[PDB]
Scaffold this active site. Structure first.
Site, PDB file in Angstrom:
ATOM      1  N   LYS A  62       0.893  -1.103  -0.090  1.00 58.86           N
ATOM      2  CA  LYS A  62       0.112  -0.073  -0.031  1.00 58.86           C
ATOM      3  C   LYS A  62       0.924   1.237   0.073  1.00 58.86           C
ATOM      4  O   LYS A  62       0.853   2.196   0.862  1.00 58.86           O
ATOM      5  CB  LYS A  62      -0.890  -0.192   1.108  1.00 58.86           C
ATOM      6  CG  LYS A  62      -2.075  -1.013   0.749  1.00 58.86           C
ATOM      7  CD  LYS A  62      -2.848  -1.555   1.587  1.00 58.86           C
ATOM      8  CE  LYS A  62      -3.872  -2.431   0.806  1.00 58.86           C
ATOM      9  NZ  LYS A  62      -4.422  -3.505   1.771  1.00 58.86           N
ATOM     10  N   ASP A  65       4.010   7.193  -0.624  1.00 56.45           N
ATOM     11  CA  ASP A  65       5.050   8.126  -0.209  1.00 56.45           C
ATOM     12  C   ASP A  65       5.093   8.916  -1.336  1.00 56.45           C
ATOM     13  O   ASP A  65       4.464   8.825  -2.355  1.00 56.45           O
ATOM     14  CB  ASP A  65       6.168   7.289   0.078  1.00 56.45           C
ATOM     15  CG  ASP A  65       7.141   8.156   1.271  1.00 56.45           C
ATOM     16  OD1 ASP A  65       7.478   9.076   1.187  1.00 56.45           O
ATOM     17  OD2 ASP A  65       7.604   7.326   2.015  1.00 56.45           O
ATOM     18  N   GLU A  68      10.079   9.896  -5.268  1.00 55.38           N
ATOM     19  CA  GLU A  68      11.453   9.449  -4.947  1.00 55.38           C
ATOM     20  C   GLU A  68      11.358   8.264  -4.067  1.00 55.38           C
ATOM     21  O   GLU A  68      12.186   7.274  -4.464  1.00 55.38           O
ATOM     22  CB  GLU A  68      12.249  10.512  -4.545  1.00 55.38           C
ATOM     23  CG  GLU A  68      12.425  11.614  -5.788  1.00 55.38           C
ATOM     24  CD  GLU A  68      11.553  12.710  -5.801  1.00 55.38           C
ATOM     25  OE1 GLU A  68      10.598  12.467  -4.992  1.00 55.38           O
ATOM     26  OE2 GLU A  68      11.849  13.815  -6.063  1.00 55.38           O
ATOM     27  N   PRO A 170     -10.319  -7.137  -1.935  1.00 52.66           N
ATOM     28  CA  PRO A 170     -10.218  -7.624  -0.381  1.00 52.66           C
ATOM     29  C   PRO A 170     -11.365  -7.375   0.426  1.00 52.66           C
ATOM     30  O   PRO A 170     -12.054  -6.248   0.070  1.00 52.66           O
ATOM     31  CB  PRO A 170      -9.084  -6.864   0.118  1.00 52.66           C
ATOM     32  CG  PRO A 170      -9.218  -5.494  -0.401  1.00 52.66           C
ATOM     33  CD  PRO A 170      -9.519  -5.896  -1.835  1.00 52.66           C
ATOM     34  N   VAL A 172     -13.351  -9.872   1.874  1.00 54.79           N
ATOM     35  CA  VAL A 172     -14.271 -11.259   1.697  1.00 54.79           C
ATOM     36  C   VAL A 172     -14.014 -11.893   3.108  1.00 54.79           C
ATOM     37  O   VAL A 172     -13.000 -12.175   3.310  1.00 54.79           O
ATOM     38  CB  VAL A 172     -13.804 -12.136   0.488  1.00 54.79           C
ATOM     39  CG1 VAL A 172     -14.412 -13.169   0.577  1.00 54.79           C
ATOM     40  CG2 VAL A 172     -14.103 -11.131  -0.640  1.00 54.79           C
ATOM     41  N   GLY A 173     -15.090 -12.265   3.602  1.00 58.42           N
ATOM     42  CA  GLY A 173     -15.207 -13.024   4.910  1.00 58.42           C
ATOM     43  C   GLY A 173     -15.208 -12.229   6.075  1.00 58.42           C
ATOM     44  O   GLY A 173     -16.217 -11.871   6.511  1.00 58.42           O
ATOM     45  N   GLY A 176     -16.711  -9.075   6.070  1.00 59.33           N
ATOM     46  CA  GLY A 176     -18.224  -8.912   5.749  1.00 59.33           C
ATOM     47  C   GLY A 176     -18.391  -9.148   4.388  1.00 59.33           C
ATOM     48  O   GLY A 176     -19.732  -9.421   3.664  1.00 59.33           O
ATOM     49  N   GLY A 177     -17.489  -9.234   3.425  1.00 61.07           N
ATOM     50  CA  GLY A 177     -17.754  -9.494   1.843  1.00 61.07           C
ATOM     51  C   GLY A 177     -18.145 -10.731   1.608  1.00 61.07           C
ATOM     52  O   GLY A 177     -17.798 -11.657   2.152  1.00 61.07           O
ATOM     53  N   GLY A 180     -19.159 -14.548  -3.855  1.00 65.29           N
ATOM     54  CA  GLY A 180     -20.042 -14.613  -4.990  1.00 65.29           C
ATOM     55  C   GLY A 180     -20.354 -13.319  -5.395  1.00 65.29           C
ATOM     56  O   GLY A 180     -20.286 -12.818  -6.853  1.00 65.29           O
TER      57      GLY A 180
HETATM   58  C1  LIG Z   1      -5.929  -3.641   1.749  1.00 66.46           C
HETATM   59  C2  LIG Z   1      -6.767  -2.512   1.404  1.00 66.46           C
HETATM   60  C3  LIG Z   1      -8.218  -2.623   1.520  1.00 66.46           C
HETATM   61  O1  LIG Z   1      -9.041  -2.069   1.054  1.00 66.46           O
HETATM   62  N1  LIG Z   1      -8.598  -3.649   2.452  1.00 66.46           N
HETATM   63  C4  LIG Z   1      -7.717  -4.800   2.977  1.00 66.46           C
HETATM   64  O2  LIG Z   1      -8.319  -5.654   3.700  1.00 66.46           O
HETATM   65  N2  LIG Z   1      -6.473  -4.591   2.638  1.00 66.46           N
HETATM   66  C5  LIG Z   1      -5.618  -5.873   2.948  1.00 66.46           C
HETATM   67  O3  LIG Z   1      -6.201  -7.101   2.308  1.00 66.46           O
HETATM   68  C6  LIG Z   1      -6.168  -7.963   3.378  1.00 66.46           C
HETATM   69  C7  LIG Z   1      -7.533  -8.363   3.826  1.00 66.46           C
HETATM   70  O4  LIG Z   1      -7.544  -9.604   4.527  1.00 66.46           O
HETATM   71  P1  LIG Z   1      -8.824 -10.199   5.440  1.00 66.46           P
HETATM   72  O5  LIG Z   1      -9.544  -9.247   5.816  1.00 66.46           O
HETATM   73  O6  LIG Z   1      -9.278 -11.297   4.557  1.00 66.46           O
HETATM   74  O7  LIG Z   1      -7.972 -10.861   6.602  1.00 66.46           O
HETATM   75  C8  LIG Z   1      -5.191  -7.630   4.305  1.00 66.46           C
HETATM   76  O8  LIG Z   1      -3.906  -8.062   3.807  1.00 66.46           O
HETATM   77  C9  LIG Z   1      -5.396  -6.192   4.365  1.00 66.46           C
HETATM   78  O9  LIG Z   1      -4.154  -5.629   4.998  1.00 66.46           O
HETATM   79  C1  LIG Z   2       6.881  11.661   3.759  1.00 70.49           C
HETATM   80  C2  LIG Z   2       5.596  12.253   3.539  1.00 70.49           C
HETATM   81  C3  LIG Z   2       5.758  13.719   2.998  1.00 70.49           C
HETATM   82  O1  LIG Z   2       5.046  14.494   2.772  1.00 70.49           O
HETATM   83  N1  LIG Z   2       6.870  13.996   2.200  1.00 70.49           N
HETATM   84  C4  LIG Z   2       8.089  13.266   2.462  1.00 70.49           C
HETATM   85  O2  LIG Z   2       9.245  13.616   1.861  1.00 70.49           O
HETATM   86  N2  LIG Z   2       8.087  11.989   3.329  1.00 70.49           N
HETATM   87  C5  LIG Z   2       9.277  11.528   3.208  1.00 70.49           C
HETATM   88  O3  LIG Z   2      10.203  12.547   4.126  1.00 70.49           O
HETATM   89  C6  LIG Z   2      11.475  12.564   3.635  1.00 70.49           C
HETATM   90  C7  LIG Z   2      11.980  13.596   2.798  1.00 70.49           C
HETATM   91  O4  LIG Z   2      13.393  13.416   2.485  1.00 70.49           O
HETATM   92  P1  LIG Z   2      14.382  14.506   1.442  1.00 70.49           P
HETATM   93  O5  LIG Z   2      13.107  14.816   0.369  1.00 70.49           O
HETATM   94  O6  LIG Z   2      14.772  15.642   2.258  1.00 70.49           O
HETATM   95  O7  LIG Z   2      15.166  13.476   0.826  1.00 70.49           O
HETATM   96  C8  LIG Z   2      11.510  11.074   2.721  1.00 70.49           C
HETATM   97  O8  LIG Z   2      12.181  10.108   3.620  1.00 70.49           O
HETATM   98  C9  LIG Z   2      10.346  10.929   2.200  1.00 70.49           C
HETATM   99  O9  LIG Z   2       9.954   9.549   2.089  1.00 70.49           O
END
Ligand SMILES: *c1cc(=O)[nH]c(=O)n1[C@@H]1O[C@H](COP(=O)(O)O)[C@@H](O)[C@H]1O
Ligand SMILES: *c1cc(=O)[nH]c(=O)n1[C@@H]1O[C@H](COP(=O)(O)O)[C@@H](O)[C@H]1O
Lengths: 215, 215
Positions: A62, A65, A68, A170, A172-173, A176-177, A180
């Site tokens: 997911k 960031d 870069e 995702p 399902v189960g 609540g999803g 089918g």
């Molecule tokens: C990621 C995004 C989203 O919208 N919903 C989610 O549940 N997830 C990931 O999918 C898996 C769902 O697993 P389960 O609820 O059947 O145990 C899980 O890896 C979650 O982080």
């Molecule tokens: C995370 C969230 C956000 O809004 N902006 C970001 O740059 N980041 C993280 O912070 C660091 C910025 O580093 P730099 O641009 O000074 O090299 C980096 O770890 C980025 O993932």
């Protein structure tokens, strides 16, 4: 995906994760591995799974960031052997394009997460989800993730991305999803807890498949 | 934090990451470690850094999953020794509360990321950011992350969270943000590339501090 079923392997220790995945392998051909397992056992677990089970591996990181850093995360994830990575679209087009550029360089795939499946998704993500899906279409994204818990939203997402795009779902189960109903719009369903916390994971996977094959 | 400066250590190999962090240690007391380093060298790098440099460690994992998975990610991250974790607010209140519950259980802290610093943040996140910050206040969040690249937005975020909340801010240097202007609203600035890609990281950190001390 074999049987249109993807296992969300979110157990946190290597032995249990290997045991359950091996027990349900005859019913799947794709395993989704995320941070619960990777942060507990290391990125090497991706190559171990890919080799041991000969399954495709989707890294569900997911990614959310700046461009870069997203590039660096994608590069490390593909170097580890993942076939695809799930990326959030909420942070915008440049962040998604950074992931697409690395997938193009490495011959892999990006899945764009539009709307999430949990209740909190209604607060901010849902209202931007149709636009996030359109952005994906405009960037050339062909793989998407949408919520099993809201089939009317999954339907609207399918409408935006077209029939040719691949959509996994995702929620399902445990959340609540229904398998089918979700498969009326998604190409494959993601199932985690309903299978991996079951007393008999293989029987749980088999039951889901039986209710699917009847579609 | 020491000198109000937090190092974003996003190098991907352990030797270079240790070299640069050690070279600038006399100018900081807090290192932000994210997925570029962790996915390349393992979660054990957090404890190694904390011990070797005796610095506080913020795990910038921009957590953006459902409640149950967020809980698992936070638990693994604190078990690894991190003092705090950065979490996205856009997935909604239940996802943020899951992180807060684990931090409370483990005696650690959660930083809520409101608006991001890159250009794409304007597409969807910016329009929801004031509300995400208000949600944080309602949940009792006391630590926040806002953008150095948009000081007028950083000012509005500060206005919502109050003077008692702690606010850190990335986007200084490479992304265009200014140390001094950002510190008008944030308590500490996050700096990555301007220091770690410099020919002399210590001189780069020292130069930034010079500007800061002058404020
Ligand atoms: C990621 C995004 C989203 O919208 N919903 C989610 O549940 N997830 C990931 O999918 C898996 C769902 O697993 P389960 O609820 O059947 O145990 C899980 O890896 C979650 O982080
Ligand atoms: C995370 C969230 C956000 O809004 N902006 C970001 O740059 N980041 C993280 O912070 C660091 C910025 O580093 P730099 O641009 O000074 O090299 C980096 O770890 C980025 O993932």
């Amino acid at each position: 995906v074999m049987n249109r079923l993807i296992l969300a392997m979110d157990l946190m220790n290597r032995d249990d994760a290997l045991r359950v995945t091996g027990e349900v392998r005859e019913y799947i051909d794709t395993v989704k591995i995320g941070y619960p397992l990777v942060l507990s056992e290391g990125m090497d677990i991706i190559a171990e799974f890919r080799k041991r089970f000969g399954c495709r591996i989707i890294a569900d990181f997911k990614v959310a960031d700046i461009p870069e850093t997203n590039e660096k995360i994608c590069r490390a994830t593909f170097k580890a052997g993942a076939d695809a990575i799930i990326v959030h679209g909420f942070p915008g087009a440049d962040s998604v394009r950074a992931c697409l550029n690395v997938a193009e360089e490495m011959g892999r795939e990006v899945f764009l997460l539009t709307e999430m499946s949990h209740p909190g998704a209604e607060m901010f993500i849902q209202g931007a989800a149709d636009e996030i899906a359109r952005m994906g279409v405009d960037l050339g994204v062909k793989n998407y993730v949408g919520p099993s818990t809201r089939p009317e939203r999954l339907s609207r997402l399918r409408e935006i991305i077209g029939q040719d795009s691949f959509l996994i779902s995702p929620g399902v189960g445990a959340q609540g999803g229904d398998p089918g109903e979700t498969l009326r719009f998604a190409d494959a369903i993601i199932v985690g807890r309903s299978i991996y916390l079951a007393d008999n994971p293989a029987a749980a996977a088999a039951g889901i498949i039986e209710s699917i094959k009847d579609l």
